Every structure is written in C-alpha cells, then in structure tokens.
Amino acid sequence: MLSKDIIKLLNEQVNKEMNSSNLYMSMSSWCYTHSLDGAGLFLFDHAAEEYEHAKKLIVFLNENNVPVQLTSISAPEHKFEGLTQIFQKAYEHEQHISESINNIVDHAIKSKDHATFNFLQWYVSEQHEEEVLFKDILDKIELIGNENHGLYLADQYVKGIAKSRK
Amino acid sequence: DHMLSKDIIKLLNEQVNKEMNSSNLYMSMSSWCYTHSLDGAGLFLFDHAAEEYEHAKKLIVFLNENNVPVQLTSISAPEHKFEGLTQIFQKAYEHEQHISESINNIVDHAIKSKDHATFNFLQWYVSEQHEEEVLFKDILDKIELIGNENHGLYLADQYVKGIAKSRK
Amino acid sequence: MLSKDIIKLLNEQVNKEMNSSNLYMSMSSWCYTHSLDGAGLFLFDHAAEEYEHAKKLIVFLNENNVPVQLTSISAPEHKFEGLTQIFQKAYEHEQHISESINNIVDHAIKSKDHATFNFLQWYVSEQHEEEVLFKDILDKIELIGNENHGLYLADQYVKGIAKSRK
Amino acid sequence: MLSKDIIKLLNEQVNKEMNSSNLYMSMSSWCYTHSLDGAGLFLFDHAAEEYEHAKKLIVFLNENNVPVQLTSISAPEHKFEGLTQIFQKAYEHEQHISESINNIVDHAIKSKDHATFNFLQWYVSEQHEEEVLFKDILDKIELIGNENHGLYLADQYVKGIAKSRK
Amino acid sequence: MLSKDIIKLLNEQVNKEMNSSNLYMSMSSWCYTHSLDGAGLFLFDHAAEEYEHAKKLIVFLNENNVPVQLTSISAPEHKFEGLTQIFQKAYEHEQHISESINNIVDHAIKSKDHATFNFLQWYVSEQHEEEVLFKDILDKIELIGNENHGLYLADQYVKGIAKSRK
Amino acid sequence: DHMLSKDIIKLLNEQVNKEMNSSNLYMSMSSWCYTHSLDGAGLFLFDHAAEEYEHAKKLIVFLNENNVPVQLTSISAPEHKFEGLTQIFQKAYEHEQHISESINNIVDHAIKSKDHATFNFLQWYVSEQHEEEVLFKDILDKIELIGNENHGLYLADQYVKGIAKSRK
C-alpha cells in the first residue's frame, strides 16, 4: 500500500520516539537523585507520553498491514550538569523530533500519500506544542536564575506544570 | 549507593533492560501476527508488550524513590522472522520462563543481603510473573488442542482474541 | 469561484460514487440469493454509505453555487463467481476510488484551492479506512478458506462486522 | 415464488425510482444555483426519499430471494426555465409514477399474489399523497404569482414545507 | 522558530483584519442611520468577529514567542449608496481577504512550516464560509429587488441571519 | 437632526478612537511581556486590551441608537519598544490617567450643554475608568515593593498573573 520510503521513515520514527522516552527517563532519574522531584516527575510523565506516540505509530502501521521492523534503541545519555543544561538538551532534542516529523510529512506530500499526510496532522500539532512547552520552561528557569533558592523555585514551577497536565 | 546494595542495584537495572527488551520482542511478534491476518494474537501480544514496558517503569520508580540512578543501556533489536502462531507462542513461553528466573534471582539476592523492604516490594512482581507464565502455557495448550489444520488458526486466533479483551 | 477542472472532477466523482453504490447493491443481492445474508447486509449497508458520499458532494457543490451535472449511471455487473471473487472485485473497486479521490486532491493542491483541499480531507481518510476494511475482510476469508463450513463462517464473520458499523 | 411478470415490474420500478431521484437532484441544483434554496432543499430531500423507495423494493426483492437486476440510470434533464416550470414537470412526473405503481398493483390482483398486493398498499398511498403535495405547491405558487416578491415568497412557502417533513 | 516571512505575513494579516473590522463598523453605522438596523446589526456583529480573528492570530504569535507589530489602522470608507452597494463592496472585500489568507498558506507550504499550515486550516475554512455567506445574502437581496417593500424585507432577511449567528 | 450636540458627538467619536488606540497599546505591551517570558503580565494586558475594545463598542452602540454616524479616523501605531516590567506599567498608568481626563472632559461638556441623558449614560464609564486607574497604581506599587531584583520579576509576574485570573 504505502511506499517503501514512507514505511522506512515511519519505522524510524517509532524508534526515535521510543528512544526519546528513554532519554526522558534517564533525565528524570537524574533529577530525582539530585532532589528535583518536580522536574523528575515532569520528565518521567513526558517520557510516558513519548512511548504513547510510538504506540500510535505502531497501530497505524499495524492497521495498514505494514510490518514493524524495530531496530535497537540506543542508550540515552546519563550524565548531566544541571537543571538548565537538561532542559537545554531537552529543547534541542524536541527541535530534532519536530524536524524528523516534518521530513515524513515532506515525503508524503511528494509521493502524494494523502491519507498518510492526513494522519500526520495531529502528530505535527502535538510536537509543535511540546516544543513550545520546553521553550517556555527553559525561559522561566532562566528568568528565575540559579542563584540561591531559584533551583528550588524552578523545580516547584516545573512541578506546577507537571500536575496540570495529567 | 547509600540504601540498597551494589548487587541489587545492578540486578534491578539489568531487569529494567530485559523488561524493555521483552516489550519490543512482543511488539515484533505482534506485528507478525497482524500482517498474517491474526489480529487476535496481534492484539494480545501488543497489549502484553505494553504491560512489559509498565513493569520496567515500576522498577524505575522504585529505583528513583530509593535515590538510585537508573542506568539504561541499549535495547537490542528483537527478532522479526517467525514460522507460525504455535512457534511464536512457544518462544513466548520459553521467554517468560527465562524472565521468571531472572526475577527469582533478584529475590534470592534480597533474601541473602536481608534487604527486607526490597523483598517486600518484589512480591507482586513475582506473582505477576508466575501468573503470566501460566497464561502462556494455557494458551499454548489450547492452541495445540485446537490444532492448526483447517479453520484452526482462525479459531485459535478467536480464542486468543477472547482472552485479550478479557484482560483490559 | 472554483476552477473548471475541479468542478468537472467533482461532478465526475459524484457519478462514480453513485455508480459504486449500485455495484454494491448488485453484489448484495447476489449474496442474499446465494444464502449469504451476512455479506448481503454488509454490502447493502456499504452501498447506502456510498450514496451518502455522493450526497455530501452534491451539497458541497450546491453551497458553492456550482451546478450539479449528473450523467448516466452505468449498469453494474450482476454475475459473480463466489464470495471470495466478490470481495476481490470489491477491493479492486475501492482501490480505483481511492485513486480518483487522490487525483482530485492533487488538482486542488496544484490550483491552490485550499478550501477545497480542506473539505476533501475527511473524504480521503474515509476512503482509505474503507479500503483497509476490504483488505482485512478479504484476508480473513482467505484465512478461513472456502472448504467445509468455510463459507458459512466467513459470512458470519462478515455479518459480525456489518452489525458493528451502523 | 413470485411470477416472472411481477419481478420484471418490480425491477422496472426500482430503476424508475432511482431515476426519479436523480431528476430531483438535478432540479434541486438548478434551484440552488438560481437563489431558490427553499425549493432546492425541498427537492433534494424529496430526491433522497425517492432513493429510499427504491431501497424498500430491493429489500422486498431480497427477502423473497429474487435477484435485483439494476440497469443503467439515464441522465436527468438539466435545463429548466423557472420555478413554476420545474414544479409542473415534477407534477407530471409524479403522475407517471403513480401510474407505474398502479400497473404493478393491477398485475398482482390478476395473478392473485395477495402478499405482494399487501406489501404495495403503503407504496400506493404514499405515492398518492406525494402527487397531491405537488399539486398543492403548484397551486400555492400560482396563487402567489411572480409579480413582485413572488419568487421570494413562493420559495419561502416551499422552504416552509421542506422543514415540516423531515 | 517560525520564518521571518511567515511572521511578517501573519502580522500583516492582523492589520488587514483589524482594518476590516473598522470597515464593517463604518458600514454598520451607515445602515443604522438609514433605518436599516437589520443590516446594521449583521455588520456590527460581523465586525466584532473580524476583530476576534485578529486576536486569534495575535494569540498564535504570542504563544510562539513572536513580537506582534501593530501598525496604524487606516480610516475606513464612510460614504455608501445603498444596501445593495454595501453588500457588493463587502463581498469584494471578503474576497480580497480570502486571497491574503491563501497567500499565507502558499508560503507555509513553500517553507514547509507544517505546523503553521495546520493552524491555518480553520481560518481558511471560516473565511471561505464567510465569503459564501455574503454571496448568498447578496443573491437573496437581488431576488427580492429594491422595489416596493424590498428594502424592508431584505433588511428583515438580514436581521434574520444576524440573530441566527450569535 | 441629531439628538446630541455637535460638540458631544465629536468628543464621543474621538473617544472611540482613543479607546481603540488604547487596546492596541495594550496588545503591544502584552506581546512585549510574552516575548520576555512574562506571560503573567502578558495575559493581564491582553485581557485588559480586550476590555478596552469593548468600551469602544459600547460607545459605538450608544451613538448608533442615537442615530449618530460613527466617524472612525486612523488608529496610530502603538509604541513597540519598552525597557522593563516597571516601565510598562508606568506608561500604562499614565495612559490610564490621560483616559480618565478625556472622559471627564466629555462629562464636563454634557453638564454644560445639559445633555442629562448623556451624562447619565456616562456614569458607568467614569466609574469603570476610575477603578481601572486605581488598579494600575496598585500593581505598580507592588512591583516597586517587590523590586526587580534577583527573583523579583518572577514574583511580580506571578502576582500579576494572580490578578489576571481573578478578573474573568
């Protein structure tokens, strides 16, 4: 049904998405172990949400009678320097994801897979929104500043958002 | 680490990895079923895969609240080629046996180091695993009863479908 | 408002869509008369659903102040070999329809009729979904096999789906 | 089961009915495109209702294990001179339909297909009523005239009826 | 995030949108002062709705962390010849807006801002619909004609629509 | 023959324009806040801007029901560059004072021409203006109380956010 290219990209996206989840879990554990259970929670929940994206793709593939060919998931990074650094990396990571998705959309436009294109709309929208979210959080962290109690407050701010997203 | 013994931590991290790995194995198997018109099995395995991933998560939460760093290593690619519904379930069953053993090994270690809280935590996990191991045996048994000669694959898939739904 | 090309294709589509339903009614009657009232029902309802698609198009054309030009509806085929053959033909018929629709979409993209494009999204998605459905059914029929009580069970399977689509 | 004659007439009626629907859609679009969305709607809905009559017949045929043989549906007329003319043609068309139905009834009486006769009662009555409806509307339109705002009012009158029939 | 081009067009659109609102308010006051409070109301409400579009766009820019550059709003036209003329100008004005929006859509397609494209869908559809609405109203008015009681009834027709849109 | 005096009409039309102009100023200010990570302030001002546009509308309605033509002139471009949260609110407050003054001027004129119905109509408008003028002063004072020190901005934005939500 769907073109060889598309299939490859979709499978690849599944992998990136699963990979992303692990990155967020890794980041989450770093936060927890450095007394930042606000960030820890946010990222852990965000990781869960990434795994769900993967699942939607697998379902889409499954329903189109396309075999899922899962390759290895690379090991996420474990060492990080601080709350700001994590979110910086996170933000750059989300930009990369937005770009892989658009790439898939480009391909559907070019091959005229209009149904695939259609399916991908929500996904694009969800990503852009998530990309913004990370941006905001990063800005807010920077507004607060790491001097003194700011790490505490920044974590509470993040905690604040975590709970208002379940 | 300050709370749990180095050994335990190693095994727990290891287990997370096996558990994540397992999920992918089941997704792979699931897709094989779907693409060979066995959406009953496909669903069962897909849901089972999801459930595997959740077990990993529970461990991670356990590790997190004990202030233990989670060290996620790479997840190997699962096998993609399988011979038939029976073969898949056979492999699944042998896979579950292996997992049951991994877990018991962790339990042995907690007993020996006297990590009684860890032991406690592991109870549900053991029971949950044992139950799943049985489930796969039954399905395999039922599959063999039915036979694969005529409409058997169909009926076997409906039987499996039957169970998939009654586990939401 | 809309371009001469688009209008022509849309009118053409209306006709194909009406034509399709007749094909499905014809197929439906064949099923009923050969004791396959499961298939009979599925196809009858599917035919009804095709006629509704036509109607949505007519409405679209009407609200854009475009005259609907209805041409002749050709007579559908009435002789068929068997349950499998019918579904095979059905499936190939759905493939053809998916393609006429995409063609319309291609044309809107090229003339930049963005509102028309927009309107066509649901239609694309619906068709694709239906195309999948026929593939599944066809696969399930083949999994069962026409030997023994195969035809019976296959009809019950189809009946099963018919009732879980009203 | 049923006699060859009856079957022929029933099939014939289905074709007529399907044909009629298209005529009404064509007429409907003419109304819409000349700013007469009241008439447009009435006819559109009336067309849908004709299609339904066809379906009831097909169902009747199906449950009696009679194959439906659908022939081609001719293209309806597209050009009309005005609201009055359309309804005039409509009315004459409905008279013709009443007559094809009666003819079927005559035949059932003569072959003593009493069950078929029974089935046909609602259809006769329903048709007779529709024939009256068109006369009334036509009459009302004439009462109104086209001298001032007649078309606007006649269309509103028609609109009035369209909504009090769903 | 978003490309400089897009942002410029989006800001430009805000301005045209605000400008549009004023045009409609101006037109509205003309209607009121010439005893056409039906039209007056329709246009007033339509003006309000235009200002909301601008606001919607402004929100979109804000959540993407894009500065909004608001320019001066030119004075609308204040002299008009009559109900028909107003709606003619209105219709023409609407088309112009449809075209500016499509232009933005063209640009997103070309730069591959797929999220922006996505966002713009509702806007395109809402616009197309509004463009149709003005055509219908104009058409209805022509149908009625400016002769005896025409203006009155046309205003009541318009009033009719105004109230069935809040 | 209008009901109202030429003077009044002129002022009222003028006021519409100032009011529309004001809204844009607030939107501009709002966007500045959003783009500098101050979505609390951003929201407050955005909502306040919307509220200014509504004032304009009430006037237009008033003029319409009195059969007075609305003459909309150009809306000037608002200022886009600002130096900080404090500066914005300072400018805001001054702007509010200037608006109060324009409104009072209209009231003065109604008293002098004895347009008692117009006077009547203008009561709510005056009261609403006074209240808004106070509000801006209060916010300004708190912001100064807090100080744009190390965590001042974040808190001042949260304070503002606090008020924004308790005004819907």
Side-chain angles (χ1 to χ4, degrees):
Chain A
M1 282 202 65
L2 310 174
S3 81
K4 287 189 141 79
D5 289 287
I6 292 285
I7 295 166
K8 189 201 178 169
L9 288 169
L10 286 173
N11 276 315
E12 163 77 316
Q13 198 53 31
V14 168
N15 188 301
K16 285 183 191 271
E17 221 66 30
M18 281 184 177
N19 190 287
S20 199
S21 160
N22 278 0
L23 184 54
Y24 288 117
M25 293 276 184
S26 176
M27 285 175 166
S28 164
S29 183
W30 194 96
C31 286
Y32 279 115
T33 63
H34 295 76
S35 322
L36 300 173
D37 58 347
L41 189 56
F42 176 85
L43 296 166
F44 176 81
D45 284 5
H46 188 65
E49 183 46 41
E50 294 300 281
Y51 193 78
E52 300 292 306
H53 288 155
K55 293 201 299 198
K56 287 205 159 74
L57 297 180
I58 294 162
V59 169
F60 173 75
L61 270 173
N62 271 348
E63 77 195 23
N64 280 254
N65 279 74
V66 186
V68 181
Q69 285 149 287
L70 298 169
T71 59
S72 68
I73 307 313
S74 300
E77 176 56 334
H78 78 302
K79 181 164 87 201
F80 308 95
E81 289 175 5
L83 178 56
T84 290
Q85 194 229 54
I86 286 177
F87 277 80
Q88 190 59 54
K89 276 184 140 202
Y91 182 54
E92 291 169 10
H93 179 67
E94 290 293 334
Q95 296 180 291
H96 187 65
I97 297 308
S98 286
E99 229 166 78
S100 61
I101 287 170
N102 291 328
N103 187 66
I104 298 159
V105 170
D106 294 334
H107 266 77
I109 291 160
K110 281 221 160 175
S111 32
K112 310 185 157 153
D113 203 325
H114 298 305
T116 300
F117 172 99
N118 269 31
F119 165 72
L120 283 164
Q121 305 280 258
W122 64 262
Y123 194 46
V124 175
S125 304
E126 249 134 49
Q127 195 48 35
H128 178 81
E129 167 186 342
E130 285 174 18
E131 195 187 318
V132 161
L133 189 34
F134 275 81
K135 205 298 153 309
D136 294 352
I137 287 159
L138 198 42
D139 282 346
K140 207 77 87 184
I141 291 163
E142 300 196 320
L143 177 67
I144 292 171
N146 63 347
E147 200 52 16
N148 302 189
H149 307 321
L151 278 154
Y152 172 53
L153 289 172
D155 193 56
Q156 299 300 292
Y157 171 68
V158 172
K159 189 168 267 155
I161 292 161
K163 292 197 166 158
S164 73
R165 278 186 69 84
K166 293 163 171 298
Chain B
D1 208 10
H2 271 106
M3 183 66 75
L4 312 173
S5 80
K6 284 216 130 72
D7 293 283
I8 292 283
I9 295 166
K10 188 182 139 264
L11 288 160
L12 284 173
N13 278 305
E14 267 159 6
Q15 197 55 31
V16 170
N17 282 302
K18 287 175 194 84
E19 219 65 32
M20 282 189 173
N21 191 284
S22 196
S23 158
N24 274 4
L25 182 57
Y26 288 117
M27 293 281 187
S28 178
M29 285 174 166
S30 163
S31 186
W32 194 96
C33 287
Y34 279 115
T35 62
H36 295 75
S37 323
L38 300 179
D39 59 345
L43 189 57
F44 177 85
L45 296 167
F46 178 83
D47 285 2
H48 189 65
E51 184 47 41
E52 288 299 280
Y53 197 82
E54 295 298 298
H55 286 150
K57 296 199 327 190
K58 274 186 172 36
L59 286 190
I60 294 172
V61 173
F62 177 77
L63 290 166
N64 279 342
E65 70 192 40
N66 282 259
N67 281 68
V68 184
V70 175
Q71 287 256 81
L72 300 173
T73 57
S74 187
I75 307 312
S76 58
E79 172 56 332
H80 299 160
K81 307 185 149 164
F82 306 95
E83 293 174 5
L85 179 54
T86 292
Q87 192 230 53
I88 285 176
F89 277 80
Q90 195 70 259
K91 265 186 110 215
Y93 181 55
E94 291 171 19
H95 181 66
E96 292 294 334
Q97 293 180 295
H98 284 53
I99 298 307
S100 281
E101 220 212 38
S102 254
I103 286 170
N104 291 327
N105 186 240
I106 299 158
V107 171
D108 295 332
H109 270 86
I111 291 159
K112 279 141 232 215
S113 31
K114 315 195 198 123
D115 202 325
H116 298 307
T118 295
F119 177 96
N120 249 285
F121 165 75
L122 282 167
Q123 304 280 255
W124 63 262
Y125 194 46
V126 176
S127 301
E128 220 128 293
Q129 190 56 31
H130 181 86
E131 189 227 36
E132 282 170 23
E133 188 181 326
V134 160
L135 192 46
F136 273 82
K137 209 257 185 316
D138 287 344
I139 287 158
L140 191 52
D141 271 352
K142 224 61 174 275
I143 292 175
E144 279 146 8
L145 183 65
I146 291 215
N148 313 39
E149 312 94 357
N150 289 337
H151 321 299
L153 276 168
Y154 171 54
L155 288 176
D157 195 56
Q158 299 300 292
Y159 170 67
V160 171
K161 188 165 268 156
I163 292 160
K165 294 265 149 171
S166 73
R167 278 183 66 82
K168 285 151 224 307
Chain C
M1 283 189 79
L2 312 176
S3 78
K4 298 193 199 272
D5 291 282
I6 292 285
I7 295 166
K8 185 182 138 276
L9 288 164
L10 285 172
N11 278 303
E12 268 157 302
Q13 199 54 32
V14 170
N15 282 300
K16 286 177 198 290
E17 220 64 32
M18 282 176 163
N19 187 286
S20 198
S21 75
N22 277 0
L23 183 56
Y24 289 117
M25 294 283 188
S26 176
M27 286 176 165
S28 164
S29 186
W30 194 95
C31 286
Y32 279 114
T33 63
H34 294 77
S35 323
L36 301 165
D37 57 349
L41 189 57
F42 177 84
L43 296 166
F44 176 84
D45 283 7
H46 188 65
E49 185 45 42
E50 294 300 281
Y51 193 77
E52 297 287 312
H53 287 155
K55 294 205 310 196
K56 286 195 194 87
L57 297 180
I58 292 163
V59 167
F60 177 76
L61 288 168
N62 279 342
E63 70 192 35
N64 282 260
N65 280 70
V66 185
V68 179
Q69 281 155 69
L70 304 167
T71 57
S72 148
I73 306 313
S74 58
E77 172 57 333
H78 66 332
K79 299 221 62 97
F80 308 95
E81 300 180 18
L83 179 54
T84 286
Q85 191 229 55
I86 286 177
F87 278 91
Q88 272 179 40
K89 276 202 175 160
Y91 181 54
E92 291 165 358
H93 182 64
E94 291 308 348
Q95 269 167 305
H96 178 307
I97 297 308
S98 285
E99 183 65 13
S100 288
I101 287 171
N102 292 329
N103 186 64
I104 299 157
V105 172
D106 293 334
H107 277 82
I109 289 159
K110 279 222 174 140
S111 31
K112 313 192 156 132
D113 202 324
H114 298 305
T116 298
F117 176 98
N118 251 279
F119 166 75
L120 284 166
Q121 302 281 87
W122 62 262
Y123 194 47
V124 173
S125 313
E126 248 176 0
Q127 189 47 31
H128 176 85
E129 199 264 313
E130 285 173 18
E131 187 184 329
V132 160
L133 193 46
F134 275 82
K135 213 259 175 152
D136 289 351
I137 287 157
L138 195 54
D139 281 347
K140 207 73 85 192
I141 291 164
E142 189 207 34
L143 179 64
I144 293 171
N146 301 10
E147 73 155 348
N148 296 132
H149 313 307
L151 261 39
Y152 172 54
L153 289 171
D155 194 56
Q156 299 300 292
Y157 170 69
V158 172
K159 191 169 258 161
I161 291 160
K163 291 179 296 200
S164 73
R165 278 185 67 81
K166 293 136 143 45
Chain D
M1 184 103 248
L2 312 173
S3 77
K4 294 169 175 91
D5 296 282
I6 292 284
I7 297 175
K8 191 172 207 278
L9 290 172
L10 286 174
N11 272 317
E12 271 155 26
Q13 193 64 7
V14 159
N15 275 327
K16 288 204 169 61
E17 225 72 33
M18 292 177 72
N19 196 284
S20 196
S21 158
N22 273 4
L23 183 56
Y24 288 116
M25 293 282 187
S26 176
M27 285 174 164
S28 164
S29 189
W30 194 95
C31 287
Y32 279 116
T33 63
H34 295 76
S35 323
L36 300 169
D37 304 42
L41 190 55
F42 176 86
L43 296 167
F44 177 84
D45 284 2
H46 187 66
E49 184 46 41
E50 294 300 282
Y51 196 72
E52 294 293 305
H53 283 148
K55 295 203 312 194
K56 286 193 167 63
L57 297 180
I58 292 163
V59 167
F60 177 77
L61 289 166
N62 279 342
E63 70 192 40
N64 282 259
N65 280 71
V66 186
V68 180
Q69 280 155 73
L70 303 172
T71 57
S72 69
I73 306 313
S74 57
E77 172 54 280
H78 294 171
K79 326 230 280 188
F80 310 93
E81 290 174 12
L83 179 55
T84 290
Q85 192 227 58
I86 286 177
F87 278 79
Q88 250 154 28
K89 276 204 164 174
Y91 181 56
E92 292 165 12
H93 178 67
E94 292 294 340
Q95 294 179 72
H96 284 57
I97 298 308
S98 287
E99 210 19 62
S100 174
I101 286 170
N102 291 330
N103 185 241
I104 299 158
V105 174
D106 292 336
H107 268 79
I109 290 158
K110 206 176 137 152
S111 30
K112 313 187 216 260
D113 203 324
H114 297 305
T116 297
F117 173 98
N118 267 8
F119 162 76
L120 284 163
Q121 304 282 259
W122 63 262
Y123 194 46
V124 171
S125 314
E126 208 155 51
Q127 186 65 35
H128 165 93
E129 186 244 315
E130 283 173 19
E131 186 180 325
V132 158
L133 194 45
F134 276 83
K135 213 262 185 281
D136 289 351
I137 287 157
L138 191 41
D139 269 358
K140 204 65 94 173
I141 290 181
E142 304 312 357
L143 174 78
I144 291 205
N146 53 329
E147 162 65 13
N148 271 180
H149 305 205
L151 288 145
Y152 171 58
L153 288 181
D155 194 56
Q156 299 301 293
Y157 171 68
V158 173
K159 189 167 263 162
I161 291 161
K163 291 213 174 160
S164 73
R165 278 184 67 81
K166 296 138 191 295
Chain E
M1 286 214 33
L2 310 171
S3 77
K4 285 224 190 110
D5 292 287
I6 291 285
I7 298 165
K8 187 137 158 283
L9 293 162
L10 287 171
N11 273 309
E12 267 158 31
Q13 197 54 29
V14 163
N15 282 304
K16 287 182 209 279
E17 231 34 48
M18 282 186 174
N19 191 283
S20 197
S21 158
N22 274 5
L23 184 56
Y24 290 117
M25 294 281 188
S26 177
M27 285 174 164
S28 164
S29 186
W30 193 95
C31 285
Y32 279 114
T33 63
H34 295 76
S35 322
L36 302 169
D37 57 348
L41 189 54
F42 177 85
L43 296 166
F44 176 83
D45 284 4
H46 188 65
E49 183 174 3
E50 293 299 282
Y51 196 79
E52 297 290 307
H53 284 141
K55 292 174 56 185
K56 263 198 257 210
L57 285 192
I58 283 164
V59 161
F60 176 76
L61 287 167
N62 279 343
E63 69 194 38
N64 282 259
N65 280 72
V66 184
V68 180
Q69 280 157 66
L70 306 160
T71 71
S72 68
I73 304 316
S74 60
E77 183 52 76
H78 53 292
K79 309 210 277 172
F80 308 94
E81 293 173 9
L83 179 55
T84 280
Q85 192 228 56
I86 285 176
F87 278 80
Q88 192 55 53
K89 276 182 156 189
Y91 183 48
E92 291 182 39
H93 178 58
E94 280 299 317
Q95 281 168 315
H96 187 311
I97 299 309
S98 286
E99 209 194 317
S100 68
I101 286 172
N102 292 329
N103 184 241
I104 299 158
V105 167
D106 294 334
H107 262 266
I109 291 159
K110 279 216 214 222
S111 32
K112 317 178 310 221
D113 203 325
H114 298 308
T116 297
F117 175 98
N118 251 288
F119 166 74
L120 285 165
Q121 304 282 260
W122 64 261
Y123 197 42
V124 172
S125 298
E126 248 162 61
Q127 187 58 30
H128 179 88
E129 195 221 331
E130 284 174 17
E131 188 184 325
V132 158
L133 193 47
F134 276 82
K135 214 266 170 309
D136 289 349
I137 286 158
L138 194 54
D139 269 356
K140 208 62 107 177
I141 282 165
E142 306 311 352
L143 180 65
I144 292 172
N146 68 340
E147 315 76 39
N148 316 19
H149 313 334
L151 279 148
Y152 171 55
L153 287 172
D155 193 56
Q156 299 301 294
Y157 171 68
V158 169
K159 192 170 260 157
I161 292 161
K163 292 192 207 177
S164 72
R165 278 184 66 81
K166 295 139 190 296
Chain F
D1 293 11
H2 342 255
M3 324 300 274
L4 313 172
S5 80
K6 295 146 224 272
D7 297 284
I8 291 285
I9 296 168
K10 186 141 217 262
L11 289 161
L12 283 173
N13 277 302
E14 267 159 38
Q15 198 54 32
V16 168
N17 282 299
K18 289 180 207 284
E19 220 66 32
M20 282 190 170
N21 188 286
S22 198
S23 98
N24 277 356
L25 184 52
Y26 289 116
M27 294 282 188
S28 176
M29 286 175 164
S30 165
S31 186
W32 193 95
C33 287
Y34 279 116
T35 63
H36 294 75
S37 322
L38 301 167
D39 59 345
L43 189 55
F44 178 84
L45 295 167
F46 177 84
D47 284 1
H48 187 65
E51 185 46 39
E52 295 299 282
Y53 190 77
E54 300 291 307
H55 287 156
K57 294 202 299 198
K58 286 187 204 73
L59 297 180
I60 292 163
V61 163
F62 176 77
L63 288 167
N64 279 342
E65 71 178 35
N66 283 254
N67 280 69
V68 185
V70 181
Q71 288 159 71
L72 299 171
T73 56
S74 319
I75 307 312
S76 59
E79 177 55 55
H80 198 209
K81 318 302 226 181
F82 310 94
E83 291 174 8
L85 180 54
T86 52
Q87 193 228 56
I88 286 177
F89 278 79
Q90 197 101 57
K91 275 182 153 212
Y93 175 65
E94 307 183 334
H95 174 74
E96 293 291 327
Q97 299 202 85
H98 185 323
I99 298 307
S100 278
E101 216 156 313
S102 53
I103 285 170
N104 292 329
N105 187 63
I106 298 158
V107 173
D108 293 335
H109 276 86
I111 290 159
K112 280 247 136 199
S113 30
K114 317 203 229 267
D115 202 325
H116 298 306
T118 297
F119 175 100
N120 253 290
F121 166 74
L122 283 167
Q123 304 280 256
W124 63 261
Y125 194 44
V126 176
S127 302
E128 253 109 62
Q129 190 57 33
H130 179 268
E131 183 280 335
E132 285 172 17
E133 185 182 328
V134 159
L135 194 46
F136 275 84
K137 211 265 171 319
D138 289 350
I139 291 152
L140 204 41
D141 278 347
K142 278 289 185 307
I143 288 168
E144 306 308 5
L145 176 66
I146 292 171
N148 305 36
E149 318 183 40
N150 309 165
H151 300 312
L153 242 59
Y154 170 66
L155 289 171
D157 196 54
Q158 299 301 292
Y159 171 67
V160 172
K161 188 167 265 159
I163 292 160
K165 292 198 209 289
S166 72
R167 277 182 66 81
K168 276 198 148 57

